[PDB]
Amino acid sequence: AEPVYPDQLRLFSLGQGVCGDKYRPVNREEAQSVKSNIVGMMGQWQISGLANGWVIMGPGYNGEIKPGTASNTWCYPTNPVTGEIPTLSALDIPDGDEVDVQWRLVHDSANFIKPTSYLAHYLGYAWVGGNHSQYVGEDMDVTRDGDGWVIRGNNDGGCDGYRCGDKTAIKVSNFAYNLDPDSFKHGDVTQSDRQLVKTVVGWAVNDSDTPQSGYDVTLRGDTATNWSKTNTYGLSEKVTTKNKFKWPLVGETELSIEIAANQSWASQNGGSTTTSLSQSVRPTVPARSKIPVKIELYKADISYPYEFKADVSYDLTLSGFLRWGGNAWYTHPDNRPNWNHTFVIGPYKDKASSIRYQWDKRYIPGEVKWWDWNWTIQQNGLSTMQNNLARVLRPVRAGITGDFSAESQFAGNIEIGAPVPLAA
Amino acid sequence: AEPVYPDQLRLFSLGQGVCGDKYRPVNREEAQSVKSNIVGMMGQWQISGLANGWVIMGPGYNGEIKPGTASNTWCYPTNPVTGEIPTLSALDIPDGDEVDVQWRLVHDSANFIKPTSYLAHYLGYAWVGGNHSQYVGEDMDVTRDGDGWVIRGNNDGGCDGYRCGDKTAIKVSNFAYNLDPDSFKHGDVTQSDRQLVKTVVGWAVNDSDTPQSGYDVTLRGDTATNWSKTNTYGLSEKVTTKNKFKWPLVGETELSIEIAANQSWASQNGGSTTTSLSQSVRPTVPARSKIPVKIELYKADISYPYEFKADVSYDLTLSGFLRWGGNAWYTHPDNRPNWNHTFVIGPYKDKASSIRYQWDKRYIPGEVKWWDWNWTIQQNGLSTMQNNLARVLRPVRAGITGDFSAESQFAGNIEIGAPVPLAA
């Protein structure tokens, strides 16, 4: 070992270490690491062979592992399938109002409602579906409720069965918008004509019988650039980031524009940066004459149609009630209890609300304090649990667009005019 | 003297200063420095010769040292074997989830369970082993308990002996991950094509009858570089360091990237540094003409597949109970007491929890306030205590991987174009 995932084991009944094409003896230590699961796969006084002269006896023997043999055996498996919940393509939401965005998510039956509905069903929630359909997740009503949204089982009309009404409700609560730097795209980039920032004019006077070319005029240092940014459609007010994001090098010019973290995107609509550029002129004015000189400095603006994407998080809540003799809550309650459990879709917050955390720790009995994902596998089949959860946890991503402009270019002229004979 | 280690002494009984091939007279001062141990090696009224006309009388004489002689003697030893607990090769743990890492350690029977089990046994703990084995440390059950792990004696099945059940449990508690700079390794290093950061364009105008080559355009100073780092597999959130770690000079470029101490590795996923590079152009424009000039600045990224190792600490706890007439607790209690003593594996914290501290001070009776390591040597043999403790205290080391990238290269172009005859 090397972790043992319960769902990869089965039972042979053909003799002394049967085994198969892709199946090898579970040893003593391996069994013990998850014997609380293995023992649940056999009858009270059922005895089966483990490996190397060791056997596992059922519940009537307290699950005890001892030396001996049997015709039943746990010669499983081979290089195990350890597929963690697969990732899927991001769900691109057409940059709208914060509310528009949320509305689109809760009404997307093909990517949100049915996937989530099946999750509830698999966990053991009762009545996940409306009175006009025989299928889970169909005939659901979407409605808004305060700061969240509710997907409810459509109790209109008649109904047969223990406890029609009190149908499992899926509530969508908190949202967060995390801007992802690497999603930066842009449209056609424009550029303005060179603008004259400033000039300086001077005269050099050589009132003598020799050139004496020893003098100068210089400009240097700052100099400054302007940065402006717009927000196309509202959402920006709730958009934040956890890292010191900087603007990408579009075209052929890099600007030192850093975006502050933990601030609304809409709160940083511009700024000012500096740079440097010096220029000098050193004339060779001929004897008895004057020469005019100029130093000129130019700008030029560039502009983008920018777009970023932000990851959208969800808080989900599943209302009661748990089905009798058929739910995944680790205690396996049979009192038809009202539940209300929450999940965080996206970033890790704690163990209880993290589907991935729990899924990834299925091999450790001591961590099973919430939902028994091993049970859900045994009931529905590993690959269906993987696909369902993959859809539930896919990465919803919302667009953020606007305009960008900046004084990015610099140019300079140094001009020396013709000599003018004195008088000065 | 020069410390005397009790375990290096024995007793001769052949006459007036017997001695041997590798054995020489213990003198008065030497004996006194550890007479509380030496006296325990003789009967109440047993008398033996020390050296130089001095003898040591047993417990009935209060261990008194006086002038005289005897046929017994303590002519021991020679250049003593003072082997401190040897160090062993680090145990490399395949960079996983914080929990994955811990799980691998507690299930490593060949490097953790049996070594630790023997430690408990040697100290005097009772029942270190399961009901299906006759050997210490075999048939142990591993289970998780809250923030720690428990290794327990497998009380399933029957059992004979005074107090079956209440078997010594080994608990593993706190962990800490200390990143070690010197473990830095990396994979294939990549490098990008030169990217254009910026340019500046200017014109020099010489409207005169002579070249007057006296002017310039310059760029200088900052300039900045970006540093990005990723975290492959979770653990990074708990990884810290006690020193101002800086990144190694990979390839041919040194970057001034300093990692803050006492912060999670995962909290420092990037940064920004600066450097400098200036460029100047000083044209020699011919009479009555113009020349265009450019100054260009370039970047280029490099990237690593990096790996560091972190030392893993442990807090160990050994539950009761101490064996009658056979334990190492310095008072030698015989009331079958429940114990619960803890040890810190790794860094020094105090005397009580430091195995190395205590081992290294065996020669000083006044420091024996916890475990009597001299007793454990007398019972098991020095070399077995050394090997066992070496395994217990070997240095577990966990991997930390991720990606690294940075704007490390710089290049620049200075271009002077061909002259263009006026008009300007």
JSON list of C-alpha atoms in Angstrom, two decimals, chain A residues 3-147:
[
{"chain": "A", "resi": 3, "resn": "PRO", "atom": "CA", "xyz": [-4.21, 3.37, -0.89]},
{"chain": "A", "resi": 4, "resn": "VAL", "atom": "CA", "xyz": [-7.04, 0.94, -1.38]},
{"chain": "A", "resi": 5, "resn": "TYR", "atom": "CA", "xyz": [-10.24, 2.28, -2.84]},
{"chain": "A", "resi": 6, "resn": "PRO", "atom": "CA", "xyz": [-13.20, 0.11, -1.58]},
{"chain": "A", "resi": 7, "resn": "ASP", "atom": "CA", "xyz": [-15.04, 0.37, -4.91]},
{"chain": "A", "resi": 8, "resn": "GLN", "atom": "CA", "xyz": [-12.24, -1.48, -6.70]},
{"chain": "A", "resi": 9, "resn": "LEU", "atom": "CA", "xyz": [-12.84, -4.68, -4.67]},
{"chain": "A", "resi": 10, "resn": "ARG", "atom": "CA", "xyz": [-15.28, -7.56, -5.27]},
{"chain": "A", "resi": 11, "resn": "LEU", "atom": "CA", "xyz": [-15.55, -11.18, -4.09]},
{"chain": "A", "resi": 12, "resn": "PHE", "atom": "CA", "xyz": [-14.55, -14.53, -5.66]},
{"chain": "A", "resi": 13, "resn": "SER", "atom": "CA", "xyz": [-16.05, -17.86, -4.53]},
{"chain": "A", "resi": 14, "resn": "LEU", "atom": "CA", "xyz": [-14.19, -20.52, -6.48]},
{"chain": "A", "resi": 15, "resn": "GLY", "atom": "CA", "xyz": [-11.51, -21.79, -4.05]},
{"chain": "A", "resi": 16, "resn": "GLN", "atom": "CA", "xyz": [-8.01, -21.23, -2.64]},
{"chain": "A", "resi": 17, "resn": "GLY", "atom": "CA", "xyz": [-6.91, -17.90, -4.10]},
{"chain": "A", "resi": 18, "resn": "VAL", "atom": "CA", "xyz": [-8.96, -17.76, -7.29]},
{"chain": "A", "resi": 19, "resn": "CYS", "atom": "CA", "xyz": [-7.85, -14.43, -8.77]},
{"chain": "A", "resi": 20, "resn": "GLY", "atom": "CA", "xyz": [-8.36, -13.18, -12.30]},
{"chain": "A", "resi": 21, "resn": "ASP", "atom": "CA", "xyz": [-6.90, -11.51, -15.39]},
{"chain": "A", "resi": 22, "resn": "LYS", "atom": "CA", "xyz": [-6.70, -8.15, -13.66]},
{"chain": "A", "resi": 23, "resn": "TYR", "atom": "CA", "xyz": [-7.03, -9.18, -10.04]},
{"chain": "A", "resi": 24, "resn": "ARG", "atom": "CA", "xyz": [-4.40, -9.86, -7.25]},
{"chain": "A", "resi": 25, "resn": "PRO", "atom": "CA", "xyz": [-4.54, -10.80, -3.46]},
{"chain": "A", "resi": 26, "resn": "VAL", "atom": "CA", "xyz": [-5.44, -8.03, -1.01]},
{"chain": "A", "resi": 27, "resn": "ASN", "atom": "CA", "xyz": [-2.95, -8.43, 1.81]},
{"chain": "A", "resi": 28, "resn": "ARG", "atom": "CA", "xyz": [-3.42, -8.13, 5.58]},
{"chain": "A", "resi": 29, "resn": "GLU", "atom": "CA", "xyz": [-2.38, -4.47, 5.92]},
{"chain": "A", "resi": 30, "resn": "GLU", "atom": "CA", "xyz": [-4.35, -3.51, 2.84]},
{"chain": "A", "resi": 31, "resn": "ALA", "atom": "CA", "xyz": [-7.51, -5.03, 4.20]},
{"chain": "A", "resi": 32, "resn": "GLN", "atom": "CA", "xyz": [-7.09, -3.49, 7.61]},
{"chain": "A", "resi": 33, "resn": "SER", "atom": "CA", "xyz": [-6.73, -0.01, 6.15]},
{"chain": "A", "resi": 34, "resn": "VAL", "atom": "CA", "xyz": [-10.39, -0.23, 5.06]},
{"chain": "A", "resi": 35, "resn": "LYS", "atom": "CA", "xyz": [-11.79, -3.27, 6.87]},
{"chain": "A", "resi": 36, "resn": "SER", "atom": "CA", "xyz": [-14.75, -1.19, 8.08]},
{"chain": "A", "resi": 37, "resn": "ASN", "atom": "CA", "xyz": [-15.91, -1.19, 4.48]},
{"chain": "A", "resi": 38, "resn": "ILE", "atom": "CA", "xyz": [-14.90, -4.71, 3.49]},
{"chain": "A", "resi": 39, "resn": "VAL", "atom": "CA", "xyz": [-16.72, -6.30, 6.41]},
{"chain": "A", "resi": 40, "resn": "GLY", "atom": "CA", "xyz": [-19.95, -4.64, 5.23]},
{"chain": "A", "resi": 41, "resn": "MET", "atom": "CA", "xyz": [-19.73, -6.72, 2.07]},
{"chain": "A", "resi": 42, "resn": "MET", "atom": "CA", "xyz": [-20.31, -10.01, 3.90]},
{"chain": "A", "resi": 43, "resn": "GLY", "atom": "CA", "xyz": [-22.89, -11.75, 6.09]},
{"chain": "A", "resi": 44, "resn": "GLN", "atom": "CA", "xyz": [-22.66, -12.00, 9.87]},
{"chain": "A", "resi": 45, "resn": "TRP", "atom": "CA", "xyz": [-21.00, -15.39, 9.92]},
{"chain": "A", "resi": 46, "resn": "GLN", "atom": "CA", "xyz": [-19.60, -15.28, 6.41]},
{"chain": "A", "resi": 47, "resn": "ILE", "atom": "CA", "xyz": [-15.92, -16.03, 6.12]},
{"chain": "A", "resi": 48, "resn": "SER", "atom": "CA", "xyz": [-13.66, -15.24, 3.21]},
{"chain": "A", "resi": 49, "resn": "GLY", "atom": "CA", "xyz": [-9.99, -15.52, 2.38]},
{"chain": "A", "resi": 50, "resn": "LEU", "atom": "CA", "xyz": [-7.81, -12.50, 2.24]},
{"chain": "A", "resi": 51, "resn": "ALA", "atom": "CA", "xyz": [-4.26, -13.50, 1.30]},
{"chain": "A", "resi": 52, "resn": "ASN", "atom": "CA", "xyz": [-1.10, -15.26, 2.45]},
{"chain": "A", "resi": 53, "resn": "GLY", "atom": "CA", "xyz": [-2.90, -17.55, 4.88]},
{"chain": "A", "resi": 54, "resn": "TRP", "atom": "CA", "xyz": [-5.11, -14.76, 6.32]},
{"chain": "A", "resi": 55, "resn": "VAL", "atom": "CA", "xyz": [-8.92, -14.53, 6.30]},
{"chain": "A", "resi": 56, "resn": "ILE", "atom": "CA", "xyz": [-11.60, -11.98, 7.11]},
{"chain": "A", "resi": 57, "resn": "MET", "atom": "CA", "xyz": [-14.55, -13.03, 9.17]},
{"chain": "A", "resi": 58, "resn": "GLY", "atom": "CA", "xyz": [-17.90, -11.19, 9.11]},
{"chain": "A", "resi": 59, "resn": "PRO", "atom": "CA", "xyz": [-19.73, -8.94, 11.69]},
{"chain": "A", "resi": 60, "resn": "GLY", "atom": "CA", "xyz": [-20.56, -11.87, 13.99]},
{"chain": "A", "resi": 61, "resn": "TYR", "atom": "CA", "xyz": [-16.81, -12.14, 14.53]},
{"chain": "A", "resi": 62, "resn": "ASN", "atom": "CA", "xyz": [-16.41, -8.35, 14.77]},
{"chain": "A", "resi": 63, "resn": "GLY", "atom": "CA", "xyz": [-14.76, -8.22, 11.36]},
{"chain": "A", "resi": 64, "resn": "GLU", "atom": "CA", "xyz": [-11.74, -10.05, 12.83]},
{"chain": "A", "resi": 65, "resn": "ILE", "atom": "CA", "xyz": [-8.78, -10.85, 10.62]},
{"chain": "A", "resi": 66, "resn": "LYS", "atom": "CA", "xyz": [-6.97, -14.08, 11.46]},
{"chain": "A", "resi": 67, "resn": "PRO", "atom": "CA", "xyz": [-4.82, -16.88, 10.01]},
{"chain": "A", "resi": 68, "resn": "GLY", "atom": "CA", "xyz": [-6.65, -19.64, 8.06]},
{"chain": "A", "resi": 69, "resn": "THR", "atom": "CA", "xyz": [-8.32, -20.14, 4.67]},
{"chain": "A", "resi": 70, "resn": "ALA", "atom": "CA", "xyz": [-11.58, -20.24, 2.69]},
{"chain": "A", "resi": 71, "resn": "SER", "atom": "CA", "xyz": [-13.21, -20.79, -0.73]},
{"chain": "A", "resi": 72, "resn": "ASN", "atom": "CA", "xyz": [-14.24, -17.16, -0.91]},
{"chain": "A", "resi": 73, "resn": "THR", "atom": "CA", "xyz": [-11.54, -14.61, -1.57]},
{"chain": "A", "resi": 74, "resn": "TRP", "atom": "CA", "xyz": [-10.56, -10.98, -2.04]},
{"chain": "A", "resi": 75, "resn": "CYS", "atom": "CA", "xyz": [-7.97, -11.27, -4.72]},
{"chain": "A", "resi": 76, "resn": "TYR", "atom": "CA", "xyz": [-8.51, -7.74, -6.07]},
{"chain": "A", "resi": 77, "resn": "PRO", "atom": "CA", "xyz": [-7.61, -5.74, -8.17]},
{"chain": "A", "resi": 78, "resn": "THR", "atom": "CA", "xyz": [-4.66, -4.53, -10.30]},
{"chain": "A", "resi": 79, "resn": "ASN", "atom": "CA", "xyz": [-3.44, -1.02, -11.05]},
{"chain": "A", "resi": 80, "resn": "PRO", "atom": "CA", "xyz": [-6.70, 0.60, -9.67]},
{"chain": "A", "resi": 81, "resn": "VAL", "atom": "CA", "xyz": [-8.82, 3.15, -11.42]},
{"chain": "A", "resi": 82, "resn": "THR", "atom": "CA", "xyz": [-8.32, 6.17, -9.21]},
{"chain": "A", "resi": 83, "resn": "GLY", "atom": "CA", "xyz": [-10.16, 8.70, -11.29]},
{"chain": "A", "resi": 84, "resn": "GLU", "atom": "CA", "xyz": [-10.73, 11.84, -9.31]},
{"chain": "A", "resi": 85, "resn": "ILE", "atom": "CA", "xyz": [-13.60, 14.05, -10.34]},
{"chain": "A", "resi": 86, "resn": "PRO", "atom": "CA", "xyz": [-12.67, 15.00, -13.98]},
{"chain": "A", "resi": 87, "resn": "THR", "atom": "CA", "xyz": [-12.55, 18.61, -15.09]},
{"chain": "A", "resi": 88, "resn": "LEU", "atom": "CA", "xyz": [-14.68, 19.90, -17.93]},
{"chain": "A", "resi": 89, "resn": "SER", "atom": "CA", "xyz": [-14.75, 22.87, -20.26]},
{"chain": "A", "resi": 90, "resn": "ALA", "atom": "CA", "xyz": [-15.61, 26.16, -18.60]},
{"chain": "A", "resi": 91, "resn": "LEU", "atom": "CA", "xyz": [-19.12, 27.51, -18.99]},
{"chain": "A", "resi": 92, "resn": "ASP", "atom": "CA", "xyz": [-18.77, 30.90, -20.68]},
{"chain": "A", "resi": 93, "resn": "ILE", "atom": "CA", "xyz": [-21.45, 33.35, -19.51]},
{"chain": "A", "resi": 94, "resn": "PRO", "atom": "CA", "xyz": [-22.11, 36.33, -21.93]},
{"chain": "A", "resi": 95, "resn": "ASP", "atom": "CA", "xyz": [-20.97, 39.35, -19.80]},
{"chain": "A", "resi": 96, "resn": "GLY", "atom": "CA", "xyz": [-24.17, 40.83, -18.38]},
{"chain": "A", "resi": 97, "resn": "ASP", "atom": "CA", "xyz": [-25.55, 42.42, -15.21]},
{"chain": "A", "resi": 98, "resn": "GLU", "atom": "CA", "xyz": [-24.62, 40.60, -12.03]},
{"chain": "A", "resi": 99, "resn": "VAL", "atom": "CA", "xyz": [-28.25, 39.48, -11.89]},
{"chain": "A", "resi": 100, "resn": "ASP", "atom": "CA", "xyz": [-28.39, 38.60, -15.61]},
{"chain": "A", "resi": 101, "resn": "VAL", "atom": "CA", "xyz": [-25.43, 36.30, -15.03]},
{"chain": "A", "resi": 102, "resn": "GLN", "atom": "CA", "xyz": [-26.99, 34.56, -12.09]},
{"chain": "A", "resi": 103, "resn": "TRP", "atom": "CA", "xyz": [-30.28, 34.20, -13.93]},
{"chain": "A", "resi": 104, "resn": "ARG", "atom": "CA", "xyz": [-28.58, 32.49, -16.83]},
{"chain": "A", "resi": 105, "resn": "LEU", "atom": "CA", "xyz": [-26.94, 29.98, -14.54]},
{"chain": "A", "resi": 106, "resn": "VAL", "atom": "CA", "xyz": [-30.03, 28.89, -12.70]},
{"chain": "A", "resi": 107, "resn": "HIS", "atom": "CA", "xyz": [-32.00, 28.52, -15.92]},
{"chain": "A", "resi": 108, "resn": "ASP", "atom": "CA", "xyz": [-29.40, 26.41, -17.66]},
{"chain": "A", "resi": 109, "resn": "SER", "atom": "CA", "xyz": [-31.11, 23.06, -17.33]},
{"chain": "A", "resi": 110, "resn": "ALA", "atom": "CA", "xyz": [-28.49, 21.26, -19.38]},
{"chain": "A", "resi": 111, "resn": "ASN", "atom": "CA", "xyz": [-25.55, 22.31, -17.23]},
{"chain": "A", "resi": 112, "resn": "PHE", "atom": "CA", "xyz": [-26.90, 23.31, -13.87]},
{"chain": "A", "resi": 113, "resn": "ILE", "atom": "CA", "xyz": [-30.37, 22.09, -13.03]},
{"chain": "A", "resi": 114, "resn": "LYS", "atom": "CA", "xyz": [-30.22, 18.46, -14.04]},
{"chain": "A", "resi": 115, "resn": "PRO", "atom": "CA", "xyz": [-26.60, 17.85, -12.86]},
{"chain": "A", "resi": 116, "resn": "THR", "atom": "CA", "xyz": [-27.39, 19.35, -9.50]},
{"chain": "A", "resi": 117, "resn": "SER", "atom": "CA", "xyz": [-30.71, 17.52, -9.30]},
{"chain": "A", "resi": 118, "resn": "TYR", "atom": "CA", "xyz": [-29.00, 14.22, -9.88]},
{"chain": "A", "resi": 119, "resn": "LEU", "atom": "CA", "xyz": [-26.50, 15.02, -7.18]},
{"chain": "A", "resi": 120, "resn": "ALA", "atom": "CA", "xyz": [-29.29, 15.45, -4.68]},
{"chain": "A", "resi": 121, "resn": "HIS", "atom": "CA", "xyz": [-30.96, 12.28, -5.87]},
{"chain": "A", "resi": 122, "resn": "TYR", "atom": "CA", "xyz": [-27.78, 10.27, -5.56]},
{"chain": "A", "resi": 123, "resn": "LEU", "atom": "CA", "xyz": [-27.16, 11.62, -2.08]},
{"chain": "A", "resi": 124, "resn": "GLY", "atom": "CA", "xyz": [-30.58, 10.41, -1.01]},
{"chain": "A", "resi": 125, "resn": "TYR", "atom": "CA", "xyz": [-32.85, 13.38, -1.17]},
{"chain": "A", "resi": 126, "resn": "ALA", "atom": "CA", "xyz": [-36.52, 12.68, -1.71]},
{"chain": "A", "resi": 127, "resn": "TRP", "atom": "CA", "xyz": [-38.78, 13.78, -4.54]},
{"chain": "A", "resi": 128, "resn": "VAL", "atom": "CA", "xyz": [-36.33, 15.54, -6.82]},
{"chain": "A", "resi": 129, "resn": "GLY", "atom": "CA", "xyz": [-38.74, 16.19, -9.70]},
{"chain": "A", "resi": 130, "resn": "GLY", "atom": "CA", "xyz": [-42.11, 17.69, -10.59]},
{"chain": "A", "resi": 131, "resn": "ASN", "atom": "CA", "xyz": [-45.53, 16.15, -10.71]},
{"chain": "A", "resi": 132, "resn": "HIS", "atom": "CA", "xyz": [-45.60, 16.13, -14.49]},
{"chain": "A", "resi": 133, "resn": "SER", "atom": "CA", "xyz": [-42.51, 13.99, -14.99]},
{"chain": "A", "resi": 134, "resn": "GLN", "atom": "CA", "xyz": [-41.17, 10.60, -14.11]},
{"chain": "A", "resi": 135, "resn": "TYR", "atom": "CA", "xyz": [-37.57, 11.72, -14.31]},
{"chain": "A", "resi": 136, "resn": "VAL", "atom": "CA", "xyz": [-35.23, 13.28, -11.82]},
{"chain": "A", "resi": 137, "resn": "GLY", "atom": "CA", "xyz": [-34.63, 16.94, -12.37]},
{"chain": "A", "resi": 138, "resn": "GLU", "atom": "CA", "xyz": [-37.47, 17.41, -14.82]},
{"chain": "A", "resi": 139, "resn": "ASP", "atom": "CA", "xyz": [-40.38, 19.72, -14.25]},
{"chain": "A", "resi": 140, "resn": "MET", "atom": "CA", "xyz": [-38.50, 21.95, -11.81]},
{"chain": "A", "resi": 141, "resn": "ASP", "atom": "CA", "xyz": [-39.50, 25.52, -11.10]},
{"chain": "A", "resi": 142, "resn": "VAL", "atom": "CA", "xyz": [-36.98, 28.30, -10.87]},
{"chain": "A", "resi": 143, "resn": "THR", "atom": "CA", "xyz": [-37.72, 31.30, -8.71]},
{"chain": "A", "resi": 144, "resn": "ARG", "atom": "CA", "xyz": [-35.79, 34.02, -7.01]},
{"chain": "A", "resi": 145, "resn": "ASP", "atom": "CA", "xyz": [-35.69, 34.38, -3.25]},
{"chain": "A", "resi": 146, "resn": "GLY", "atom": "CA", "xyz": [-33.92, 37.35, -1.73]},
{"chain": "A", "resi": 147, "resn": "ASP", "atom": "CA", "xyz": [-30.21, 37.15, -2.33]}
]
